[PDB]
Amino acid sequence: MDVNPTLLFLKVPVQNAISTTFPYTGDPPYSHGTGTGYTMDTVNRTHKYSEKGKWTTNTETGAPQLNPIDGPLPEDNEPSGYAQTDCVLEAMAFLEESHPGIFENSCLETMEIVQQTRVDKLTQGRQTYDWTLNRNQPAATALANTIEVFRSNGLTANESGRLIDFLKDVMDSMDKEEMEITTHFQRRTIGKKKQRLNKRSYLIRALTLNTMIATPGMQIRGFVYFVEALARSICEKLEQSGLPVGGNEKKAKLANVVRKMMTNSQDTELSFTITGDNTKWNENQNPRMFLAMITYITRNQPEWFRNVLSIAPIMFSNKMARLGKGYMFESKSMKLRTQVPAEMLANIDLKYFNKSTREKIEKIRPLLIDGTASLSPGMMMGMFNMLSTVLGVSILNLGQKKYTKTTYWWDGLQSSDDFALIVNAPNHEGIQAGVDRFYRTCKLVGINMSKKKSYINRTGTFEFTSFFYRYGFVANFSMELPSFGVSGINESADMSVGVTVIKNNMINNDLGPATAQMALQLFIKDYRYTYRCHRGDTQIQTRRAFELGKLWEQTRSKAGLLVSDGGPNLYNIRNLHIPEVCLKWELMDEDYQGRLCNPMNPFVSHKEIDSVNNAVVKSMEYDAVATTHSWIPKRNRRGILEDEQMYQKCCNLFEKFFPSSSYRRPVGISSMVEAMVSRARIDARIDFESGRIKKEEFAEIMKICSTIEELRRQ
Amino acid sequence: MERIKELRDLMSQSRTREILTKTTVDHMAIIKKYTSGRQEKNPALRMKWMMAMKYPITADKRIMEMIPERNEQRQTLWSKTNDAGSDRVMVSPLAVTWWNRNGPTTSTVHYPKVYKTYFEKVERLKHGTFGPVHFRNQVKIRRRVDINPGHADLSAKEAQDVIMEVVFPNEVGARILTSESQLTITKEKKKELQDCKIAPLMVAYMLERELVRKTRFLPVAGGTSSVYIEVLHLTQGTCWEQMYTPGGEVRNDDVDQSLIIAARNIVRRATVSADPLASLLEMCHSTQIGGVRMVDILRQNPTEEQAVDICKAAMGLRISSSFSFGGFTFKRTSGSSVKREEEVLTGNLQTLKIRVHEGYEEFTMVGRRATAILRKATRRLIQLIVSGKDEQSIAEAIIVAMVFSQEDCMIKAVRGDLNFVNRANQRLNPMHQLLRHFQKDAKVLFQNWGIEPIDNVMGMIGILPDMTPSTEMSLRGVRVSKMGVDEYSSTERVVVSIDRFLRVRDQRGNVLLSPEEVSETQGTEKAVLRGFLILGKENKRYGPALSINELSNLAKGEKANVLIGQGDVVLVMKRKRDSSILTDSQTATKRIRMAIN
Amino acid sequence: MEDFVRQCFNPMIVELAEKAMKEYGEDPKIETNKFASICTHLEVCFMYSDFHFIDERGESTIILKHRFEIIEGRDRTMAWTVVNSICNTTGVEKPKFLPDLYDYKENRFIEIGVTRREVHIYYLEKANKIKSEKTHIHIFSFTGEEMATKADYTLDEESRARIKTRLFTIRQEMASRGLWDSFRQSERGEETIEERFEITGTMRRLADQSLPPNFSSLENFRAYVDGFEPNGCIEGKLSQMSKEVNARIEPFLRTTPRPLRLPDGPPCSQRSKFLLMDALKLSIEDPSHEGEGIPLYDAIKCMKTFFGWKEPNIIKPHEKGINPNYLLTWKQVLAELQDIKNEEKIPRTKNMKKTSQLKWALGENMAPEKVDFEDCKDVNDLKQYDSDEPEPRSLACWIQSEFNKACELTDSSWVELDEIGEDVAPIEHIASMRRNYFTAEVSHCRATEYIMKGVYINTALLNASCAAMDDFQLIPMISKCITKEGRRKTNLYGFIIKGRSHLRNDTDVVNFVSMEFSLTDPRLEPHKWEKYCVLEIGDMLLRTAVGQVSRPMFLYVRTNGTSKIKMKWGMEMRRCLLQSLQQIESMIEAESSVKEKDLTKEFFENKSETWPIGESPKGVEEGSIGKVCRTLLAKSVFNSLYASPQLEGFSAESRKLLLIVQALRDNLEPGTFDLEGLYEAIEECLINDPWVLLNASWFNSFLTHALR
Ligand SMILES: [Mg+2]
Numbered sequence A: 001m002d003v004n005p006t007l008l009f010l011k012v013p014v015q016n017a018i019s020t021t022f023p024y025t026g027d028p029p030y031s032h033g034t035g036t037g038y039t040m041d042t043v044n045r046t047h048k049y050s051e052k053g054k055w056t057t058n059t060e061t062g063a064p065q066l067n068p069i070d071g072p073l074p075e076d077n078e079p080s081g082y083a084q085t086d087c088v089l090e091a092m093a094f095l096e097e098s099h100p101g102i103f104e105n106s107c108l109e110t111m112e113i114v115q116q117t118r119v120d121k122l123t124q125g126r127q128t129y130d131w132t133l134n135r136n137q138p139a140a141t142a143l144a145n146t147i148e149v150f151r152s153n154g155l156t157a158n159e160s161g162r163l164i165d166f167l168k169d170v171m172d173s174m175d176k177e178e179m180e181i182t183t184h185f186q187r188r189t190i191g192k193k194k195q196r197l198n199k200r201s202y203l204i205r206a207l208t209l210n211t212m213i214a215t216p217g218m219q220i221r222g223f224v225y226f227v228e229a230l231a232r233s234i235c236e237k238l239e240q241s242g243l244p245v246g247g248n249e250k251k252a253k254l255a256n257v258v259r260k261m262m263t264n265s266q267d268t269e270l271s272f273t274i275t276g277d278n279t280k281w282n283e284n285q286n287p288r289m290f291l292a293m294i295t296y297i298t299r300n301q302p303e304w305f306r307n308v309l310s311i312a313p314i315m316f317s318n319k320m321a322r323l324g325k326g327y328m329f330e331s332k333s334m335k336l337r338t339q340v341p342a343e344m345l346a347n348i349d350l351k352y353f354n355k356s357t358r359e360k361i362e363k364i365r366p367l368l369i370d371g372t373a374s375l376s377p378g379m380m381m382g383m384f385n386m387l388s389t390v391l392g393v394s395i396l397n398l399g400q401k402k403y404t405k406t407t408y409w410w411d412g413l414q415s416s417d418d419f420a421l422i423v424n425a426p427n428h429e430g431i432q433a434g435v436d437r438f439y440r441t442c443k444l445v446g447i448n449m450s451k452k453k454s455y456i457n458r459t460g461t462f463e464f465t466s467f468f469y470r471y472g473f474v475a476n477f478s479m480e481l482p483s484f485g486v487s488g489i490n491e492s493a494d495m496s497v498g499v500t501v502i503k504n505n506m507i508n509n510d511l512g513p514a515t516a517q518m519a520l521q522l523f524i525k526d527y528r529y530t531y532r533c534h535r536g537d538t539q540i541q542t543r544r545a546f547e548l549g550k551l552w553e554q555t556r557s558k559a560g561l562l563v564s565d566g567g568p569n570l571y572n573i574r575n576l577h578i579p580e581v582c583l584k585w586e587l588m589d590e591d592y593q594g595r596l597c598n599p600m601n602p603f604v605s606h607k608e609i610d611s612v613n614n615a616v617v618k619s620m621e622y623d624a625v626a627t628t629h630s631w632i633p634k635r636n637r638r639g640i641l642e643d644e645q646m647y648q649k650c651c652n653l654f655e656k657f658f659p660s661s662s663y664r665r666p667v668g669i670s671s672m673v674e675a676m677v678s679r680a681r682i683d684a685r686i687d688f689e690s691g692r693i694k695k696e697e698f699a700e701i702m703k704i705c706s707t708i709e710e711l712r713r714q
Numbered sequence B: 001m002e003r004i005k006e007l008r009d010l011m012s013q014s015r016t017r018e019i020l021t022k023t024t025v026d027h028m029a030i031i032k033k034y035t036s037g038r039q040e041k042n043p044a045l046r047m048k049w050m051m052a053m054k055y056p057i058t059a060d061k062r063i064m065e066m067i068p069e070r071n072e073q074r075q076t077l078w079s080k081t082n083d084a085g086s087d088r089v090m091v092s093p094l095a096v097t098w099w100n101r102n103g104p105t106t107s108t109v110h111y112p113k114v115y116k117t118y119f120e121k122v123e124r125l126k127h128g129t130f131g132p133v134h135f136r137n138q139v140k141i142r143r144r145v146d147i148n149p150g151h152a153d154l155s156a157k158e159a160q161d162v163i164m165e166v167v168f169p170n171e172v173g174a175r176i177l178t179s180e181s182q183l184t185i186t187k188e189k190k191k192e193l194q195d196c197k198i199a200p201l202m203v204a205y206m207l208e209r210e211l212v213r214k215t216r217f218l219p220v221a222g223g224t225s226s227v228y229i230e231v232l233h234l235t236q237g238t239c240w241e242q243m244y245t246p247g248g249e250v251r252n253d254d255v256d257q258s259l260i261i262a263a264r265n266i267v268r269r270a271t272v273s274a275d276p277l278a279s280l281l282e283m284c285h286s287t288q289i290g291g292v293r294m295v296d297i298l299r300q301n302p303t304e305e306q307a308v309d310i311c312k313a314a315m316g317l318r319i320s321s322s323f324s325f326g327g328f329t330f331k332r333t334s335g336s337s338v339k340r341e342e343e344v345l346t347g348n349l350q351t352l353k354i355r356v357h358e359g360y361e362e363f364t365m366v367g368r369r370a371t372a373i374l375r376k377a378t379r380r381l382i383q384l385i386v387s388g389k390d391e392q393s394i395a396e397a398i399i400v401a402m403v404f405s406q407e408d409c410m411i412k413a414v415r416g417d418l419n420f421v422n423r424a425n426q427r428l429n430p431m432h433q434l435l436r437h438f439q440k441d442a443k444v445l446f447q448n449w450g451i452e453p454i455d456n457v458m459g460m461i462g463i464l465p466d467m468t469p470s471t472e473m474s475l476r477g478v479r480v481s482k483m484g485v486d487e488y489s490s491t492e493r494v495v496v497s498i499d500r501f502l503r504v505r506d507q508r509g510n511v512l513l514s515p516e517e518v519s520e521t522q523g524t525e526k527a528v529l530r531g532f533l534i535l536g537k538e539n540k541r542y543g544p545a546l547s548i549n550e551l552s553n554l555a556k557g558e559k560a561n562v563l564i565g566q567g568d569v570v571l572v573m574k575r576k577r578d579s580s581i582l583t584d585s586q587t588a589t590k591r592i593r594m595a596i597n
Numbered sequence C: 001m002e003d004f005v006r007q008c009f010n011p012m013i014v015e016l017a018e019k020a021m022k023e024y025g026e027d028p029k030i031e032t033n034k035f036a037s038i039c040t041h042l043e044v045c046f047m048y049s050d051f052h053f054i055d056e057r058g059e060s061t062i063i064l065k066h067r068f069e070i071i072e073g074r075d076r077t078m079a080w081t082v083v084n085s086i087c088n089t090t091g092v093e094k095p096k097f098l099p100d101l102y103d104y105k106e107n108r109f110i111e112i113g114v115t116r117r118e119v120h121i122y123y124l125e126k127a128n129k130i131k132s133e134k135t136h137i138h139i140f141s142f143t144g145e146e147m148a149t150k151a152d153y154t155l156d157e158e159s160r161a162r163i164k165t166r167l168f169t170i171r172q173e174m175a176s177r178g179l180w181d182s183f184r185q186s187e188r189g190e191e192t193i194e195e196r197f198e199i200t201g202t203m204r205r206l207a208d209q210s211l212p213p214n215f216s217s218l219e220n221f222r223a224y225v226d227g228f229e230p231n232g233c234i235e236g237k238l239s240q241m242s243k244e245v246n247a248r249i250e251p252f253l254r255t256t257p258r259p260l261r262l263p264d265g266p267p268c269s270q271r272s273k274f275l276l277m278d279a280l281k282l283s284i285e286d287p288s289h290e291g292e293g294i295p296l297y298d299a300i301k302c303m304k305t306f307f308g309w310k311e312p313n314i315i316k317p318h319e320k321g322i323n324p325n326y327l328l329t330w331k332q333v334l335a336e337l338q339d340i341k342n343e344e345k346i347p348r349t350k351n352m353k354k355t356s357q358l359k360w361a362l363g364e365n366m367a368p369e370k371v372d373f374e375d376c377k378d379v380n381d382l383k384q385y386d387s388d389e390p391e392p393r394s395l396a397c398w399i400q401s402e403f404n405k406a407c408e409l410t411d412s413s414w415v416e417l418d419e420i421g422e423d424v425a426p427i428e429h430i431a432s433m434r435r436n437y438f439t440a441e442v443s444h445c446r447a448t449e450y451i452m453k454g455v456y457i458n459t460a461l462l463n464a465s466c467a468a469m470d471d472f473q474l475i476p477m478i479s480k481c482i483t484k485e486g487r488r489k490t491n492l493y494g495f496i497i498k499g500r501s502h503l504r505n506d507t508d509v510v511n512f513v514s515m516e517f518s519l520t521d522p523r524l525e526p527h528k529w530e531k532y533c534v535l536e537i538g539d540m541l542l543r544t545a546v547g548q549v550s551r552p553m554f555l556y557v558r559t560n561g562t563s564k565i566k567m568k569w570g571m572e573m574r575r576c577l578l579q580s581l582q583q584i585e586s587m588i589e590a591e592s593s594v595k596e597k598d599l600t601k602e603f604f605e606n607k608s609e610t611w612p613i614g615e616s617p618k619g620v621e622e623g624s625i626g627k628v629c630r631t632l633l634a635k636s637v638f639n640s641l642y643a644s645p646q647l648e649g650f651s652a653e654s655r656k657l658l659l660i661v662q663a664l665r666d667n668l669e670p671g672t673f674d675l676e677g678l679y680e681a682i683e684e685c686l687i688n689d690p691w692v693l694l695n696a697s698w699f700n701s702f703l704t705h706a707l708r
Helices: A005-010 A036-049 A085-098 A102-116 A117-124 A139-152 A163-173 A199-206 A224-234 A247-263 A287-297 A303-316 A342-347 A354-368 A385-397 A428-445 A491-507 A513-530 A545-554 A590-596 A646-651 A672-690 A695-713 B001-013 B014-022 B024-031 B045-052 B092-102 B118-125 B156-167 B184-192 B200-211 B255-271 B275-287 B294-300 B306-316 B389-404 B430-440 B443-447 B548-553 B586-596 C002-008 C011-024 C033-048 C076-090 C119-130 C159-175 C180-186 C202-208 C217-228 C231-240 C295-304 C323-343 C356-361 C398-406 C427-441 C446-467 C564-571 C575-595 C625-641 C644-663 C676-684 C690-707
Strands: A054-057 A065-066 A128-130 A135-136 A178-185 A192-199 A208-211 A214-216 A268-276 A321-322 A324-333 A336-343 A372-374 A409-414 A420-425 A449-458 A461-464 A465-472 A475-476 A612-615 A619-621 B129-137 B141-146 B214-219 B239-247 B328-332 B337-345 B350-360 B361-367 B370-378 B378-388 B451-453 B460-465 B471-474 B480-481 B497-498 B503-507 B512-513 B531-538 B557-562 B568-573 C052-054 C060-062 C067-068 C102-103 C106-116 C133-142 C147-148 C282-284 C313-314 C371-373 C470-484 C488-498 C509-518 C533-544 C549-564 C611-616 C619-623
Touching: A005 C625, A005 C690, A036 A085, A036 A372, A085 A385, A085 A428, A085 C231, A102 A163, A102 A224, A102 A287, A102 C488, A117 A139, A117 A163, A117 B024, A117 B350, A117 C356, A128 A208, A135 A139, A135 A224, A135 B512, A139 A178, A163 A224, A163 A303, A163 C202, A178 A199, A192 A199, A199 A208, A224 A287, A224 A303, A247 A409, A247 A420, A247 A672, A247 B306, A268 A428, A268 A461, A268 A475, A268 B568, A287 A303, A287 A354, A287 A385, A287 B568, A287 C217, A324 A342, A324 B045, A336 A342, A342 A619, A354 C533, A385 A409, A385 A420, A385 A428, A385 B014, A409 A428, A409 C102, A420 A428, A420 C202, A428 A449, A428 C202, A428 C231, A449 A475, A449 B001, A449 C644, A449 C676, A461 C644, A475 A491, A491 A513, A513 C575, A612 B118, A612 C323, A619 C398, A646 B014, A672 A695, A672 B001, A672 B014, A672 B024, A672 B557, A695 B014, B001 B014, B001 B255, B014 B568, B045 C446, B045 C564, B118 B200, B129 B531, B129 C575, B156 B184, B156 B200, B200 C575, B239 C147, B255 B275, B255 B294, B255 B306, B275 B294, B294 B306, B306 B497, B306 B503, B306 B512, B350 B430, B350 C231, B361 B389, B370 C067, B378 B389, B389 B430, B430 C133, B430 C159, B460 B471, B471 B480, B497 C106, B497 C202, B503 C202, B531 B557, B531 C159, B531 C282, B548 B557, B568 B586, B586 C011, B586 C067, C002 C011, C002 C033, C002 C159, C011 C033, C033 C067, C033 C106, C033 C159, C033 C180, C076 C159, C106 C119, C119 C133, C119 C147, C133 C159, C147 C159, C159 C180, C202 C217, C282 C295, C295 C323, C295 C470, C313 C323, C323 C356, C323 C509, C323 C533, C323 C549, C398 C446, C398 C690, C446 C470, C446 C488, C446 C575, C549 C564, C575 C625, C611 C625, C619 C625, C644 C676, C644 C690
Parallel strands: A208 A321, A336 C371, B378 B480, C106 C133
Antiparallel strands: A054 A065, A128 A135, A178 A192, A208 A214, A268 A420, A268 A449, A321 A372, A324 A336, A409 A420, A461 A465, A465 A475, A612 A619, B129 B239, B141 B214, B328 B361, B337 B350, B361 B370, B370 B378, B451 B471, B460 B480, B497 B503, B503 B512, B531 B568, B557 B568, C052 C060, C067 C102, C102 C106, C133 C147, C282 C488, C313 C533, C470 C488, C488 C509, C509 C549, C533 C549, C611 C619
């Protein structure tokens, strides 16, 4: 007998047992599928799809650019980005007609967001291509470095503290004739280095996408951020959209649409559902199309708002794609390896590369400028998802029976990457005609539906973004099982996070009681192993075992000690929500209770409120008692800033004089130094008054404060 | 001392001095987000790796004086080292356990007080009651629900103010020192936490957690109270259910009902008034609900009703673009319609002036006991779907939907006069009168409404005119779902227009809300360091600056210099005239109001 | 900002500001800085004139007639009329510009202004603007500063303090709300200006170059878009584009589908980290010896329980390596074991002396040196890194046998899950029942042995790597177990030697050599072990019906590499358990829903209901709940062990075909457009992996069954 679990799908329907078709529980440990060759393929295919368009020469970067818009009508089923502006405008007009006032209210909310936002928001992004150092760097450090360079280049609008001010600063920068970059050499002796960038060099650096998929520089974060705010505002008001809702709302949306399309169907109407994916989403979304749709959306609006919203597509339409690290060359005769940076790929012979790479380089050479390829048509992932969703929802909404003028009519959702159409018509001829019309209109707008990945079946069953719908039952596997191991904050934080995630999975993720019990057992075992806090009675001979044994031999109510101190686990489906120290507070021994919770212990540390009893993964919040087991683990570890920690050093010593600064964003008009000076003077005076300070300290403090005053005045 | 010497060191360098003198305290938190470090990806792997080391835990210098270098077994507790970026000495978990087993001991008297929320959870569990499990199909309707019981439902700003006064006594902003209402809770907490050595940041966070409200979108199938949500994992399952009851204390307030009654009275008494807008505004500005002005409650409470919505429209704010008709919250979802005025003759020879919507519109209705959808054409009912726990809920929901449709078929199906008049003896609009009439009796309409067969499919069943399930025949476009329908997921708030008649009109010229739609039911109504006025920037003549905590010694009317906010020295005085900032501008307000009109 | 203005000030003043601005044809929703400025202006005006009255004798008083008269809150005609009336009645001179207030006690027009900037500058601007000495000036600042002519401030200290404090609180609230900066900015001298953001210079050219073909300037495009109306553009385009651009539904009915074609080539070879079904363990039933617990002590005690150490010799050569060096590695391991045995002072860990065979085995310094391309650009042999197509292979039956041996039970229990709180709630009791039943079902299965063995291996590896940075550490492969007699048994699968562990990233690899005992003969299936080196290290007596038969005991040595991420993923294999349960419990629960009663006993103890869980020559084979439990557990554990990108690609691209065929089964009349594309996408994922080829065969079998 041979075990063959796939045969199980002869009794248990596929949707019911879908958990078996998902191999991994967590991140697979290889993380492969990216490289410079992939970027070459992407550029070549993007320019291939749009090849039939007009070829132009940009006046600033000198790079060639492609314009497929209003191109000749597609004649074949291959993916084509030859979208028509008139058609997208008509589609947006109909969308506004069927949802009057959506564009206007979205614009008002976006205006509010533009006005109130701040610069520091850009420190909340992911890895970012710092143009100043010409490499990837953290969002916070990249922003600090860009601010430093702008300050050294006489651009300090961002000093006001507003994101739009930083955008105006970038505006000033890109029109500058030359940019000066200063760097320090940190060892042995320290020096200085100055570099000068002409207008074209900096312009190219601003419109670059470092590929590691790609990440733009701080130049093009704010404009896309505001366009994303607008798109999110529009989508929040659309029923057919799929963003930015969570797991629970997706099921409701799916059920609503399916019931609406099925029940309204009469006894003489046939219904079908097309579960579909898009051939190549970001490779056929011309930025000009988004500019046209934003122009339509922001009709009759303040000009500043229109321009702030229009910069992002304008910037993206002339963007540059970087070519990563380069290539690796290996010689077997002398077992000699070398790295060739992609910069010289323009002017290197075509004999070290295989046939496929030779074709790639031959196709990409004419489009290569200063080591970066000019990619006008197409787009990159993770930036214009919401606006693309808006366009998809517009074309879907075009299906209303009034527009079609004929019996057939369609509806459904759209989540950018994938979608699920539903078509109603009298006969199968009607269904065919409706699907044909939908397909042709999507092509005209410039959208290609993956014919291979898209299948059509009578209404009742479908899939949508990993949500499997079968006759009303929706199965969720978008994220699959979470990570039940210790997150790795500290003892108490990890315990609370584990119990809380088990509880949340039980409430929302449809997890079972026995499954929750087993998850708790596994988590407690993992915790005990990781933190060397095995039971005081058990002998496992770890580094910590002796002290735990002494503690156990010392106490009396051994059922009260924490897990991390050698105590029994007392959790269950009953009290997953109860913090540990509380859950066994009553049992705690008086002396152990006093020691464990002594607030003068040197092992407790609290950071700013945003990082107190909260962890970043998305983020989740946990409840725990600040005990001796709340310690913080040790930290592990060409720069424009002379001292990378000057800002962190500065904010510290503010918390000292003003502890409230840690809790709430402090507000005041006086500069900081005078604030510390006044607080210190008052504190020293009152300290002398009490009698715990003598004359010498008072004199020293006042001399020091006076000297600081003189130093700051000058 | 250490702090001032460190500040002097910082000032010595050019760049630190420049950043100190340039940046204003307002933007301090902006330069707190400029971190040059690197966030650790996959911290679980990092923790696993770290725990294997000898000294992976960071302690402070003072530890050198209390915990000896080695224990009895000569193990190394703390090492003469420093962390990367500070002077935090390096210690091992052995140090933590040694501290726990042999460290100095104190009294955790304030720990229950600071941590009342968690201990409240403990008590609620410890006194609960369980019951037999039941296995059956579970329907979990999705909705918003509270999270933390025991909260005062204060706004985040108010919670921040309370925390600042409680734990940061001499660092409170200017608003508190120019404030009058010293909340009772603040004094209660100040008395409770007299001698508390707990880290003040921890105390502040715990008070914030305790005094704030939180709401989440969850699928529930049973009790929705806050104490019934914290045990939702234990109570509801996919195929089972658990009988449970918390055994603590519930804090269900009643201010919402009082606000309902107040708004209803205001609208009822202002609709007949000469100038309802200014009149209602004056009332709302001068009315108190249980010791608090109604304006704060209106701005805070998320109530949804016709009276309160019209009050907001008059005052000027955002309200949901929907109406609660017949006890059901409606919401448009798709299509568009145009409002047209017409005269309709009923089956009782009664002429009514009505306004009907023409268009292929779609609505979703969520009631107290049902959920429904309705697709309506131009004066034509196309499709109706309802789902409800009981048959009576089904019937009332369907009656509401059909009267909303305003089709011509039911017009000839009216039997009896429609002369209903509210308790105020004010003529009711035709649609409400029809709604009440069909509530009284609709059998005749059911017999003459419409009957047609329906194909049989899973998940949905028909209804006969006597309101009984059927699979082979039902009413025109009337159907019932055997599974609960999830409520609306979002609501759209748009700018609306209000006329003097308290009718709210949308930007398209249609009307949204009317006082006539308001139910006429009647219910029952269930060393203070404050009072200081600043006198501009610091003045040297008055003497050296004082700390806020020591302001109490000031004589009546004496003016001194005190440090308010996060280091802002200002000249303040005690009050002499027993007034407040509330009554200012009222006289000039009324004067200019008379002038404009 | 606009919301803040509406909420913070008296609504009537908001109405006055709205009317005053609407007089100028402005909309607050477009401009709010002016709205906030006007609201502040009216508020300060009405504050100034409040609580002031004229007594019977004419002296001022605080609570008749208002000492201050407001002029700023009125229309142009009204304000002009009232100022003219004041001038005539009190004989006052006409100011060149409209004042704000009129003080009756001193009989003078006073203009008042709130400035976001310094007080003095605003005072000078106002004085220069008015150019008259007959109008008093009172300037306030949000910061707490004010100024007036001669410092003759009309009000008393109390009212000045009130106005100062109101403005100060307004400033603090605006700052805390993140609007103070824009408010202070919008003030330009004596007027408030709308926020401006205009495209000039570089972006102007960029926008001119980023428009559709038939447009030349961004302004022309904006004008075209603004004036556009929907007139059958889409209909005309559809009527134009050729019919060949269409989505045709291809019928899918019981005949179209075909099996997936596997790649041709030689049989695929084992690639697991450790031996799975061919391992042998040296056992000690009760480790009650001195210094127990340390892996080295247990390993040595297990070693001493076996005799038959004969001279090893290469049996299955490492086709690429140097077999004698592997032989010398094993000999050194044995010699160090004897040496430490005779030392009598076994420490916690054993560090191996560096040697030629060790350094070569762990790949120490066998790496090409890095050079600049230009320096060696003349080398003829220089060529891009070899990244050609991986060799296609053929599914070999060893994978199926391994899986079949994985889904079967053992003699002892390979899991010791920790404790939980006592059950109180009835659902807690049902959960405990279900959990205990599942645990008993899979507490001894082979997959659980794999889980425990790998967990221990990776835990020891990582701990030694962190503790021993620059040493060669000898790590016995040990496991613990509970025999049918309930005795704590210890098992020794083999040994592992780790190279240099100076690891910094989560993807850089540490190289190790693993030597696992075994009893199989590689020569039977050489292609299985083409990455291993096998030394016949001894002879073992196996008991059978014919007595004790001697068999050759082998020792598979191989060189492998592990990354920190891979070690963590190895230590996470226990989560596999949960996965299995999460697929059965649902089924249980499902039936309960259709039965309205619990079904744990009628499933875990009935042993009558069955599901098709395999294939056999007779037909499809049906299995009980335990069969499915252990089958799913084994599938999860193997997926963990044989994880590869091709696996996930095939799974994702095969789910679609599964759903299509199932929809056909439900009589839903499914259809497709480019099914051949789906088949090609699925087929592209089958190249070399044993696991993926096995799954493809399984899918072919399932399609064959379902089609009939
Ligand atoms: Mg899809």
